[PDB]
Structures are given as C-alpha cells and as structure tokens.
C-alpha cells in the first residue's frame, strides 16, 4: 500500500497539472505552453517504466488504477490537440487579416482614377500600371493558394471552427477575383485615355505642321533664285502628299474614336477634328494660287 499512497498521488497531481483552464492567450503563448504539454506527455510516458514495479508488486484496486494511465494519456492525446488547434487558429487568423490588408493596399492602387493630362505621361502610367498587373496578379495567386491550402489542411484535420475558415476562404477568394477584375477594368480605362490623348497630340502636331506650311508659302514665293525655285516647290509637294497619308490616319482615327465616346466628349472630338480639317482647307486653298 506504499503503491496506492504514492503512485495514485503522483497521478493525482499529474491530472491537475495537465487539466487546465488556460487554452492559450496569444500566438506565441499557445506555443510556449504546448512545449510544456509535450514535456508533461513525455513524463507520463516515462512513467511507463516505473509501473513495472507496481505491476510486479500487485501481481505476486488494481483494476481501478490500470485505467488511469490510459485516461491521463487520452487526456494528453486530447489537450495536445486542443493546444495545437489554438495555435493554428491564431496563425490562420493572422494570415487572413494580413492578406485582407494586402488586397486592401493593392485595391487602392487599382481604384485610382488618374488618367493624366497629356499623352506622353498617361502612356507612362500605362506601363507603371501594367507592371503592377503582373506583380500583384502572380504574387496574389501565390498568397491566395498558400492561405487556401492553410484552410483545406485545417479542414481535413477537423478543427473546431472550420466553418469560419470556409467563409474566410470565400471571403478571400471572392475579393481576390474581384481584384483581378478591377485591374482588368482599370487597364481598359487607361487604353482609352491613351488613344484619346494620341488623337489630341496628333492634332497638336498636325495643326502645327499645317500652320507652318500655310505660313511658309509667302516665303516660297519671295532674296530668291530660279534654280532652287521649281525644285523647292516640287519638294513641298512631296511633303504635302505624305501629310495626306498622315491625316488619312487622323480622320480614320477620329471615326473609331467618336463611336466610343458620347455627348460633351463626342461634341469636343467634333470641334477638335473640325478645327484641324478647317486648317486643311485654309492651306489647301492657298496652295492652288
């Protein structure tokens, strides 16, 4: 009866230590508490090499205590799983929150509406975005897949709060494909702001090429010489016959352009191209006489 007084007492204090009302406070708590749980479990398992003295003493109340080792190592094989859970929860949560804030931070860049003030630099913004398209696209695919499979692992385990992890999975994957879409919109918006500007600047270079021509004709009739008279005139004709090839692409651009826009915008495209064709007439008439 030294047995039922000393060993029953040892398992008496073993039960109290292992059983606990602390499941784990923060992420790095559960961990440095679970370490302690694996110490306690190995100490219970290393009390299997002291129950051969009790078995020998009894064999040469026994059914009461024969169960208590399998019960304190089933309480071990349960509260090990509870602490594992409470860590993995804190991990998955932190990954989710941080990932939401990544979708968050990148969302702002997508949703920005700056479509420039001129061709050159909106044509920059085109690139400065399309890079972010890939960086975000692929890097997201990654972070998504990693977190997704974090959940699917915790599911197949059979975590207590998996349901929440499911609606977290949807809550992420949805907002993700939303992001993808959003970038695909932004992209197109930029493409249009581009073509629109390309038009505008093409006007600013044609109205200028022509407003040069019509100005430089008086110079080409007046100082002078006969041997560089016909040659100069024929060369100007060589120019104008390429200016027409350019403006065919100008009118032919304006047409496809009007069809995309409407109202104040289309009414302004009208006045721009009407203005430049009017410059065409005011050169065209001069070059007859």
């Amino acid at each position: 009866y030294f047995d039922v007084a000393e060993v029953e007492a040892w398992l008496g204090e073993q039960e109290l230590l292992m059983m606990s009302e602390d499941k784990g406070k923060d992420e790095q708590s559960t961990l440095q508490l679970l370490k302690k749980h694996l110490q306690l479990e190995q100490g219970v398992e290393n009390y299997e090499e002291s129950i051969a003295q009790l078995s020998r003493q009894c064999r040469a109340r026994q059914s009461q205590v024969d169960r208590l080792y399998v019960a304190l190592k089933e309480l071990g094989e349960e509260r090990r799983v509870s602490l594992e859970q409470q860590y993995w929860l804190y991990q998955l949560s932190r990954q989710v929150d941080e990932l939401e804030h990544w979708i968050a931070e990148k969302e702002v860049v997508a949703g920005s509406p700056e479509l420039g003030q001129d061709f050159e630099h909106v044509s920059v913004l085109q690139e400065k975005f399309s890079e972010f398209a890939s960086e975000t696209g692929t890097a997201g695919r990654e972070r998504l897949a990693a977190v997704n499979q974090m959940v699917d692992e915790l599911i197949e385990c059979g975590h207590t709060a998996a349901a929440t992890m499911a609606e977290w999975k949807d809550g992420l994957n949805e907002a993700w494909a939303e992001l993808l879409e959003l970038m695909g919109t932004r992209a197109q918006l930029l493409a249009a702001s581009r073509e629109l500007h390309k038009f505008f600047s093409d006007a600013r270079e044609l109205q200028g090429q022509i407003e040069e021509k019509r100005r430089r004709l008086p110079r080409l009739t007046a100082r002078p010489s006969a041997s560089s008279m016909q040659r100069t005139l024929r060369a100007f004709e060589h120019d104008l016959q390429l200016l027409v090839s350019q403006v065919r692409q100008l009118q032919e651009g304006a047409a496809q352009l009007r069809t995309v826009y409407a109202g104040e915008h289309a009414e302004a495209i009208a006045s721009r191209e009407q203005e430049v064709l009017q410059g065409w007439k005011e050169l065209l008439a001069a070059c007859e006489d």
Binding site: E178, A192, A262
Partner: protein, 422 residues
C-alpha cells in the same frame, strides 16, 4: 462580371456572374464615356442608416451599391436586380428606394416606360418576356438615367395612390376624401391587407381586411369617408384603430363608441378625421378584442419570402433554408457532403421558426426540432444519423399537435449515400 466592368458608348448587355438575375444594360449612345459600372449587393448588417421600413413593409433584395456615384446617362438604362420577396399576386408590390449618398432615402421613379425605343436597335434586345414574367422570376426592373449611390427594393402592400380612392386589391374598400378637406392637393395612398381565415385558426373570433391610408397621422380637415368589408361570423362587432405613424409599430384600441358605423351590403361606411390603421373584429367578447387582435397582427406583419430549401448529407445531415447564397457551398463540398434535395421556391415567414418531421429510412438520433428562418441569412440545421428500407423523405411544417392535421410546408425525398455506417 462579378462586381464591375468598363463600357463605352457602344453599349453593354452585362449580366452578373455572382448573383443570378443581376443584369445591367447600357444601350448604345447612353454612357457618358467608357466607365466603370458596378453593382454589389452589400450585406444589410454591414451598412448603417439603412432605408427605413414600416410595419408590414419588407426588404426584397439586399442593397445595391452602384458603380458610378453620379453618372448621368443620356438615354435610360436598366438594372435588373433579383429579389426574394413573396408577391402573393398583387397582394403586395415592390417600391424602389434610392439614396444619393447613403444618408437621405427617397423613392425612385421614371414617368415614361417604353420597350422598343430605350434599346435603340440593340441587337440582343431580350426584353425579359412580359412584366408578368418578371413578377414570376422574382426580378425587379429598375430603370434610371442616372445612377444613385444606393438602391433598395422593398415589398409593401399595394398602396393605390392619387392626389376618390378605392383599393386595387379589394374593391369593397372604397375610401374617398370629400371636397375641400386637404390644404394642398397632395398624393395620398390606400393600402388594403386582407386576412386568410386559414391563419385566423392560429388564434375563434373573426376579422376583416386591415385598411390603411398611407399619409399617416395627418389630420383631415373635413371628415373622410371609409368603406371596409366585414368579417364573416363565429354588441358583437368592434372596430379598431391605430394612429401611430411611420417607423414605429402601431397599437390598437376599440373605438366603436366614437365612430358611427354605417351599414351597406357586405361592408361598413364611416367617417374619421385622421389618417390611420382601421380593422374590424366581430366577436362577442370585447376585452379580448384588443389583444386577440395584436396577437394576430404580429403574424400578419411578418415579411414573406420565396426561399429555397436544400438538404445536405454526408455519412450525417445538415439542413438549410436559404436564398441568394452561392449554390456551390464551399464548406460542405469540402467536408465531402452531397446536396440530396434542393426544393422549389416556397413562401416562408421571416421570423416564424420552421419545424421538421421525418417520414423516412431511419429516425433522428434521440425533443422536437426547429430553426428560425430569417431573410438573407444562412440557416443551420444539423442532424445526427428493419434495415430493409433504402431511402426516406422528410418534410418541413409551420405547425408542430397530432390533434388535427396542420399540413406541411415542403415534402422532400432523401437517400443516404452510405459509404460507411455509424
């Protein structure tokens, strides 16, 4: 699309990938420019100052944040939003709110409605069948030429409105304002909610339509006539009224003495001077007619919804009542479950708990079981499951009793997959 898409003045015919029904249409030459159009059904809980509802009015869909807060279209455009409000064949209607900035809530309306002209030779015109077809498909067509920041869809009662007024639901409910009783010739509406006898069984003593005049708690300068049809049978007759207005719920009281009760075949004409809730009750005990009304009233004000009933199983059951959720439920398809029965669309009571009985292969483990249906929430009902019988059918009922048969709501037939036992 899922939430957004860009569109130019070539016009776009875009349906919503995520929520079946959703469909924005922008006809050609109607968008200001290429623009980001959006249409997201935000959760009711997430928002603040949600559009105010009254006693008996009901939220049909979620709220729908739109893509351009202030876009002003040249033409008109359509937003088909799908709802789940029970319509009950004109016993209820759908009024469409709009908030410009999610603080101020106004009704939204367009005076002119046309089919062939709004589309402007749109190739896939695809007007969705007839308007009745929309009413059957639980679609609400909103037509605007400028996108307000937030729409609501709402199921009121029919409130036929003018600025003489008889109800489009029940015609023996003619309530006409007399000459010169209103200072400003203002719109006024007449609502007419009947009562099914079938539900009078719930809690004996009879009732008439619940008549209401929409501009409430506003005194009428010259007495205003009323006509209400009478209940059938079981002083005997008491008339009730509540004067409370708008957001707050009403309260009832007997006012037989203060009102002269003129009789005409099938109904009752009388005067009041205040716009309020009127309701009749023939029964020969008067002290109860207040509370026996407000017990019944509680039942009538609940909102109806055409909900789907789906049962998921995996050897072992999880039962669901839902609307507007993605069908491919991730939680269950991952836990390896099988949708064993997805039922037709069924009017259920946003509040009233719904019961389940089992007429099947095996009984439930080990009290009766119930789960309260709410609108736009997922509704969990988990389970625990002669060996000759392969399959079984379970059914859902609004009444629990075994004295009289209170017929059920939904009969569904199930089949365990039986990859193992338990």
């Amino acid at each position: 699309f899922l939430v957004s898409f860009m569109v130019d003045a070539r016009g776009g015919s875009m349906r919503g990938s995520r929520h079946h029904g959703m469909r924005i249409i922008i006809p050609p030459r109607k968008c200001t420019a290429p623009t980001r159009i959006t249409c997201r059904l935000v959760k009711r809980h997430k928002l603040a100052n949600p559009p105010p509802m009254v006693e008996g009015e009901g939220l049909a869909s979620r709220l729908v944040e739109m893509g351009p807060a202030g876009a002003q279209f040249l033409g008109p455009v359509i937003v088909e939003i799908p709802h789940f409000g029970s319509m009950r064949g004109k016993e209820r209607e759908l009024i469409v709110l709009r908030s410009e900035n999610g603080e101020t809530w106004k009704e939204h309306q367009f005076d002119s409605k046309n089919e062939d002209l709004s589309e402007l030779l749109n190739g896939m015109d695809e007007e969705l069948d007839s308007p009745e077809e929309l009413g059957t498909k639980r679609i609400c067509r909103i037509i605007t030429k400028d996108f307000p920041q937030y729409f609501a869809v709402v199921s009121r009662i029919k409130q036929e409105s003018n600025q003489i007024l008889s109800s489009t639901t029940v015609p023996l409910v003619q309530a006409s304002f007399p000459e010169g009783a209103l200072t400003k010739r203002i719109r006024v509406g007449l609502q007419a909610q009947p009562v099914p006898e079938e539900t009078v069984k719930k809690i004996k003593a009879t009732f008439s339509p619940i008549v209401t005049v929409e501009p409430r708690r506003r005194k009428f300068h010259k007495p205003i006539t009323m006509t209400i049809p009478v209940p059938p049978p079981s002083p005997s007759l008491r008339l009730l009224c509540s004067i409370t207005g708008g957001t707050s719920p009403a309260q009832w009281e007997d006012i037989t003495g203060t009102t002269p009760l003129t009789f005409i075949k099938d109904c009752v004409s009388f005067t009041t001077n205040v716009s309020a809730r009127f309701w009749l009750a023939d029964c020969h005990q008067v002290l109860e007619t207040v509370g026996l009304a407000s017990q019944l009233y509680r039942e009538l004000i609940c909102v109806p919804y055409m909900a789907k009933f789906v049962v998921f199983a995996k050897t072992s059951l999880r039962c669901f009542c839902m609307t507007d959720d993605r069908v491919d439920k991730t939680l269950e398809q991952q836990e390896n479950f099988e949708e064993v029965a997805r039922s037709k669309d069924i009017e259920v009571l946003e509040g009233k708990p719904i019961y389940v009985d089992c007429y099947g292969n095996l009984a439930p483990l080990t009290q009766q079981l119930v789960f309260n249906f709410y609108s736009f929430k997922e509704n969990r009902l988990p389970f625990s499951i002669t060996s000759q019988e392969p399959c079984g059918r379970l059914s859902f009922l609004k009444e629990p009793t075994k004295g009289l048969p209170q017929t059920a709501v939904c009969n569904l037939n199930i089949t365990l997959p039986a990859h193992k036992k338990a």
